[PDB]
Design an enzyme around this catalytic site. Structure first.
Site, PDB file in Angstrom:
ATOM      1  CG  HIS A 236      -1.344   4.028  -0.062  1.00  0.00           C
ATOM      2  ND1 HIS A 236      -1.944   4.478  -0.748  1.00  0.00           N
ATOM      3  CD2 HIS A 236      -1.350   4.543   1.063  1.00  0.00           C
ATOM      4  CE1 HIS A 236      -2.721   5.482  -0.532  1.00  0.00           C
ATOM      5  NE2 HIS A 236      -2.493   5.536   0.898  1.00  0.00           N
TER       6      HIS A 236
ATOM      7  N   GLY B  88      -6.583  10.715   5.327  1.00  0.00           N
ATOM      8  CA  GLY B  88      -7.495   9.761   5.759  1.00  0.00           C
ATOM      9  C   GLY B  88      -8.730   9.258   4.642  1.00  0.00           C
TER      10      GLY B  88
ATOM     11  CB  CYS C 166      -6.421   6.610   0.745  1.00  0.00           C
ATOM     12  SG  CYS C 166      -5.353   8.089   0.441  1.00  0.00           S
TER      13      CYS C 166
HETATM   14  C1  LIG Z   1      -4.601   8.719   1.821  1.00  0.00           C
HETATM   15  O1  LIG Z   1      -5.482   8.834   2.696  1.00  0.00           O
HETATM   16  C2  LIG Z   1      -4.092   9.889   1.414  1.00  0.00           C
HETATM   17  C3  LIG Z   1      -5.070  10.923   0.846  1.00  0.00           C
HETATM   18  C4  LIG Z   1      -4.352  12.412   0.275  1.00  0.00           C
HETATM   19  C5  LIG Z   1      -4.032  12.930   1.648  1.00  0.00           C
HETATM   20  C6  LIG Z   1      -4.293  14.639   1.213  1.00  0.00           C
HETATM   21  N1  LIG Z   1      -5.184  14.584   0.171  1.00  0.00           N
HETATM   22  C7  LIG Z   1      -5.233  13.205  -0.118  1.00  0.00           C
HETATM   23  O2  LIG Z   1      -5.819  13.230  -1.359  1.00  0.00           O
HETATM   24  N2  LIG Z   1      -2.914   9.846   0.307  1.00  0.00           N
HETATM   25  C8  LIG Z   1      -1.705  10.151   0.588  1.00  0.00           C
HETATM   26  O3  LIG Z   1      -1.318  10.598   1.757  1.00  0.00           O
HETATM   27  C9  LIG Z   1      -0.610   9.917  -0.320  1.00  0.00           C
HETATM   28  N3  LIG Z   1       0.510  10.965  -0.515  1.00  0.00           N
HETATM   29  C10 LIG Z   1       0.093  12.270  -0.883  1.00  0.00           C
HETATM   30  O4  LIG Z   1      -0.875  12.503  -1.307  1.00  0.00           O
HETATM   31  O5  LIG Z   1       1.112  13.077  -0.986  1.00  0.00           O
HETATM   32  C11 LIG Z   1       0.808  14.768  -1.244  1.00  0.00           C
HETATM   33  C12 LIG Z   1      -0.100  15.239   0.072  1.00  0.00           C
HETATM   34  C13 LIG Z   1      -0.694  16.353  -0.302  1.00  0.00           C
HETATM   35  C14 LIG Z   1      -1.267  17.057   1.019  1.00  0.00           C
HETATM   36  C15 LIG Z   1      -1.217  16.353   2.198  1.00  0.00           C
HETATM   37  C16 LIG Z   1      -0.627  15.125   2.302  1.00  0.00           C
HETATM   38  C17 LIG Z   1       0.200  14.641   1.332  1.00  0.00           C
HETATM   39  C18 LIG Z   1       0.229   8.612   0.040  1.00  0.00           C
HETATM   40  C19 LIG Z   1       0.760   8.472   1.489  1.00  0.00           C
HETATM   41  O6  LIG Z   1       1.452   8.449  -0.988  1.00  0.00           O
HETATM   42  C20 LIG Z   1       1.302   7.483  -1.808  1.00  0.00           C
HETATM   43  C21 LIG Z   1       0.378   7.354  -2.448  1.00  0.00           C
HETATM   44  C22 LIG Z   1       2.444   7.797  -2.931  1.00  0.00           C
HETATM   45  C23 LIG Z   1       1.977   6.086  -1.076  1.00  0.00           C
END
Ligand SMILES: *[C@H](O)[C@H](C[C@@H]1CCNC1=O)NC(=O)[C@@H](NC(=O)OCc1ccccc1)[C@H](C)OC(C)(C)C
Ligand SMILES: *[C@H](O)[C@H](C[C@@H]1CCNC1=O)NC(=O)[C@@H](NC(=O)OCc1ccccc1)[C@H](C)OC(C)(C)C
Lengths: 306, 306
Positions: free
Chosen positions: A41, A143, A145
Site C-alpha cells: 500500500h 509510519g 508499516c
Molecule cells: C502503516 O504505517 C500504518 C500503520 C498503522 C497506523 C496506526 N497504527 C498502525 O499499525 N497502516 C495504516 O495506516 C493502515 N490503516 C490503518 O491502520 O487504519 C487504522 C488506523 C488506526 C490508528 C491510526 C491510523 C489508522 C493503511 C493506511 O490502510 C490500509 C492497510 C487499509 C491500506
C-alpha cells in the site's frame, strides 16, 4: 533465575531496515540481498485506499517513483514486482549485512520479536504472540508499516511478520513475508474487525511451569484431572482445548519440575474457577498466555545466538 | 496505538560483547575501543569467593591468564587494571564496532534495556527498572555476568549497568560501568539481601496516562485531591511520595490527555483503595510502575535512533 518477556537481539534485523518513499507515503522496507520488501500500500494515495486495484496501480508506477534510502545512502531501484500484498523492489546493491534468513509463516500461539521502525530507523524491540484470531497486540504508530517480526535460531533469522495496519480495537494485522495476510484481513479500507479470540491454553501451562521453576508454587495442589474434564473447563472460560500433542510438548517442563502435565491442568482449573485470591504469579495478577513452551525452556536454560 | 514493554534495538551493544575466561570462570565482557570491561570476580575461584582481597588476587594474575574471544577471534590482552568492582583488560585491537557511548549512572525509578548474554553471545533483550532498593528484577542464569544495561539517545549508547550477581529473593544486583555497585551490595559471598522496596509512584501515573492515551478510561473520575492528601495515601500503600518535580515532568502527558496531574492522582487514590474490581489497565491487572514518563512519551509518539 527470573522470567521477563524477552526479545531476540535485534542487530541482525536492524542492518536490513530501510526507508521506502513513494509519492507522499513513507514506510519501512526490509533489504535482503538485492531486494527491498515492503507493504504494497506504499503505492496508494488517500483516495486510492477506498477500493484499490493494486495491479492497475503498479503498472502506472516507474522504478524512479520509489525512493529507497539505506541510512543516509540512496538505493537505486532497478525493478519492481508485486507478491500478494508485498512489493519486491529490486535494487542495484546487495545488502552486505544480509544475515542468513528464511521466510516462515507462524501458527497462532507462537511468538516472535518485533523490531518497530520509523523512516527506516529502528525504534524498539518487543515480543508478540500471534493471537488465535490472527491479530497481534503490538505497539505501532503512523509510519511503522514494513516493520517485521522474526525469530532467530543460531545465526538464521526466520522472518515471519510484516506490519500493515491497525484494527479498530487497537490490535494489529499484517502478512507473512510472502505477502499473505494472517487472518481474514485485507489491505484496503473496510469495516474489518478482529473477530473472537481465545486464550492459548498450552502457553498458560508453560508459564505456570516457568513460575514453579522460579519458586512460585502456591497455586500447586495434590488434585489431578483427566484431559477430558480439563477441556470442559477450558471451553467454559474461553480457553483453547488442550491436545495430547500439547501434553507431549510440555513433557520436558513436566519432567524438570516433577509436576505431571495433568496435575498442572488441575491447578489451572482451580485458578480459573477461584481466581488468584489477591496473589500473583511471576509478577502478574493475570494468567499469561504469550510464552510458548520453547520460550520458557529457552529462558529457564539460557540459549544464545551467533 | 498499543503499549508494550519495549527495549532499545540491541545491535550497537551486540557488536561489543565478548567472552572473558580466566581459570575456570567464564563470563561476558564489554569491548569498547581497546578495553574489555568485565566483573572483577572473574579472577576469583570457588574458595576465593568467601572473603577475597581482589587487590592481592590481581597482582598474582598475568595478561596471558585472560582469554578474551570476540566471536571466533581471540583478543590479545596487553594490560589489566581494576576499577572498583570491574576489570579493565587492555587488548591490542580497538573494537571497530565501538558506537558512540557514555558511562552514566542511573537513578532508581529509571529504566534501561538489558542485553542478556552467555559466553559473549547475545541471548535476548528486555526492559528493566532500577528498583528503589537498587535491585533489578531481571532474567539471569549462570554465565550472564558482564551483561550490560543501556539506553540509546539518537546514536549514543549510555551504558548504565553491568550484571554481577543474584540475591536470594531472585532479584539482581550489579554496578555502573565504573564498577560501583547500585545499592548496599558487595561482590563477595555474604547473607546480603534486597532490602525493603516501594512502588515508583510517578511511573504508575505515567502508565495511567499511557492507558488514557490508548483508550482505557474506566478508572477516570471527576474527583481531585491535593498533593498532600495524595501523599498520605501513597505512604499507606507503600508508594513513594510524589514531588512537585514529578508533577512538572508529568505536564506533557497531562496536557495531551487534558487530565490534570492531581486528577490522575485522585484516580490512583481510588485504584489503591478499591482495587480494579475485575477490570484491567493496558492488559494488566496490577498497577505497573516500570514505565517512566519518558518511556510513555517515546512510545505514544514514536522516537527512533541512528
Ligand atoms: C502503516 O504505517 C500504518 C500503520 C498503522 C497506523 C496506526 N497504527 C498502525 O499499525 N497502516 C495504516 O495506516 C493502515 N490503516 C490503518 O491502520 O487504519 C487504522 C488506523 C488506526 C490508528 C491510526 C491510523 C489508522 C493503511 C493506511 O490502510 C490500509 C492497510 C487499509 C491500506
Ligand atoms: C555471574 O555469571 C553470576 C550470575 C548469577 C548466577 C545466577 N543468576 C545470576 O545473576 N553471578 C554469580 O554467580 C554470583 N553469585 C550469585 O549470584 O549467587 C546467588 C546465586 C543464585 C542462583 C544461582 C547461582 C548463584 C557470584 C559468583 O558471586 C559473587 C558476585 C558474590 C562473587
Amino acid at each position: 533465575s527470573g522470567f521477563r518477556k524477552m526479545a531476540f537481539p535485534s542487530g541482525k534485523v536492524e542492518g536490513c531496515m530501510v526507508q521506502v518513499t513513494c509519492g507522499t507515503t513513507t514506510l519501512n522496507g526490509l533489504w535482503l540481498d538485492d531486494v527491498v520488501y515492503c507493504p504494497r500500500h506504499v503505492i496508494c494515495t488517500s483516495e486510492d485506499m477506498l477500493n484499490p486495484n493494486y495491479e492497475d496501480l503498479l503498472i502506472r508506477k516507474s522504478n524512479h517513483n520509489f525512493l529507497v534510502q539505506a541510512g543516509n545512502v540512496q538505493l537505486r531501484v532497478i525493478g519492481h514486482s508485486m507478491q500478494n500484498c508485498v512489493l519486491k523492489l529490486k535494487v542495484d546493491t546487495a545488502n552486505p549485512k544480509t544475515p542468513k534468513y528464511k521466510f516462515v509463516r507462524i501458527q497462532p500461539g507462537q511468538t516472535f520479536s518485533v523490531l518497530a521502525c520509523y523512516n527506516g530507523s529502528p525504534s524498539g524491540v518487543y515480543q508478540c504472540a500471534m493471537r488465535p484470531n490472527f491479530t497481534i497486540k503490538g505497539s505501532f504508530l503512523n509510519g511503522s508499516c514494513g516493520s517485521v517480526g522474526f525469530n532467530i535460531d543460531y545465526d538464521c533469522v526466520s522472518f515471519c511478520y510484516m506490519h500493515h495496519m491497525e484494527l479498530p480495537t487497537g490490535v494489529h494485522a499484517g502478512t507473512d513475508l510472502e505477502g499473505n495476510f494472517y487472518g481474514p484481513f485485507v489491505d484496503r479500507q473496510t469495516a474489518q474487525a478482529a473477530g473472537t479470540d481465545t486464550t492459548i491454553t498450552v502457553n498458560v501451562l508453560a508459564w505456570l511451569y516457568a513460575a514453579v521453576i522460579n519458586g512460585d508454587r502456591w497455586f500447586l495442589n495434590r488434585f489431578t484431572t483427566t484431559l477430558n474434564d480439563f477441556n470442559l473447563v477450558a471451553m467454559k472460560y474461553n480457553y483453547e482445548p488442550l491436545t495430547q500433542d500439547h501434553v507431549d510438548i510440555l513433557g520436558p517442563l513436566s519432567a524438570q519440575t516433577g509436576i505431571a502435565v495433568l496435575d498442572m491442568c488441575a491447578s489451572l482449573k482451580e485458578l480459573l474457577q477461584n481466581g488468584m485470591n489477591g496473589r500473583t504469579i511471576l509478577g502478574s495478577a493475570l494468567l499469561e498466555d504469550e510464552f510458548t513452551p520453547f520460550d520458557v525452556v529457552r529462558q529457564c536454560s539460557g540459549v544464545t545466538f551467533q
